[PDB]
Amino acid sequence: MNIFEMLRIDEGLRLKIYKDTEGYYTIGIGHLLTKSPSLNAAKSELDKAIGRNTNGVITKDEAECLFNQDVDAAVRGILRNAKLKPVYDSLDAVRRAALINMVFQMGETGVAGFTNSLRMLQQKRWDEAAVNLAKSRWYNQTPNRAKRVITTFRTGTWDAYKNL
Ligand SMILES: *CC(=O)N1[C@H]2C[C@H]3C[C@@H]1C[C@@H](C2)N3O
Ligand SMILES: [Cl-]
Ligand SMILES: [Cl-]
Ligand SMILES: [Cl-]
Ligand SMILES: [K+]
Ligand SMILES: [K+]
């Protein structure tokens, strides 16, 4: 297991524009295109992202390209964020992946707002952090995925992604 395999499980792979859990146009391995309700706006974003006139379908190679870019961007967003960088630096490898996963799903600003959870993670108070992380819109809207990420923070193992 690694961050790529973890996010591939959590995000799936679809080669045509689809709506994500929040109803937003997405493609590939969880590549958000836009929050606009306009499908044409989403197709314009896709064409710009891929560099060709795509009319909404991409190849697996193109999906994996966006995924590489998106994982790299999540890591770089963590490291440039004054709230997230110290937490990331304090964590072991498995828990670093859990934090990247959250940023991939919700964005840097959203995760950076989990102030009390982030402090508990820095303090290595893993059971307390796990309880606090579940008191969130995130956990209520995507409970199975949030449970997997939270188990990863609680235990520091990949156990929640084994059997998947
Ligand atoms: C991201 C990626 O893997 N790429 C992009 C740049 C080059 C090489 C590959 C496939 C495609 C998109 N190509 O233009
Ligand atoms: Cl629509
Ligand atoms: Cl709550
Ligand atoms: Cl879920
Ligand atoms: K998805
Ligand atoms: K604890």
Burial class (CB in 10 A: 0-12, 13-18, 19+), 144: exposed
Reference 151, options 162, 140, 8; nearest CA is: 162
Can you list the alpha helix ranges (DSSP code H) found in the chain? 3-11, 39-50, 60-80, 84-90, 93-106, 108-112, 115-122, 126-133, 137-141, 143-155
The strand pairing partners of 28, in sequence order, are 14
Q: Which CATH fold would you assign to the domain 3-161?
A: Lysozyme (1.10.530)
Which residue reads 């961007």 in tokens?
A: 73
Closest-approaching ligand to the CA atom of 121: 6
65 CB less than 6 Å from ligand 1?
A: yes
13 CA from centroid of ligand 5 (Å): 8
Which residue reads 């960088």 in tokens?
A: 85
54 CB less than 6 Å from ligand 1?
A: no
Reference 145, options 110, 90, 104; nearest CA is: 104
Q: Which long-range contacts (CB under 8 A, 24 or more apart) does 24-33 make?
A: 27/56, 27/58, 27/63, 27/66, 28/58, 28/62, 28/63, 28/64, 28/66, 28/67, 29/63, 29/64, 29/66, 29/67, 29/70, 30/67, 30/70, 30/104, 30/105, 31/63, 31/66, 31/67, 31/70
Helix (H, G, I), strand (E, B) or coil at 14: strand
In the chain, the amino acid numbered 132 is: N
Q: Which of 10, 11, 62, 108 is the catalytic position?
A: 11
Helix (H, G, I), strand (E, B) or coil at 45: helix
Q: 88, 111 in Cβ contact below 8 A?
A: no
DSSP 113: T
Q: 4, 67 in Cβ contact below 8 A?
A: yes
Burial class (CB in 10 A: 0-12, 13-18, 19+), 135: exposed
Reference 103, options 129, 80, 122; nearest CA is: 80
CA dihedral over 130, 29, 77, 157, signed as positive or negative: positive
The strand pairing partners of 14, in sequence order, are 28
d(CA 113, CA 93): 22
Ranges of each domain in the chain? 3-161
1 CB less than 6 Å from ligand 1?
A: no
Exp. method: X-ray
Q: 64, 29 in Cβ contact below 8 A?
A: yes
Distances (CA, A) of 28 to 13, 74, 77, 125, 139: 5, 16, 21, 35, 23
Which of 50, 52, 62 is the pocket-test mutation for ligand 1 (most atoms within 8 Å of CB)? Answer: 62
Instruction: Tell me which H or E stretch contains 26.
Output: strand 25-28
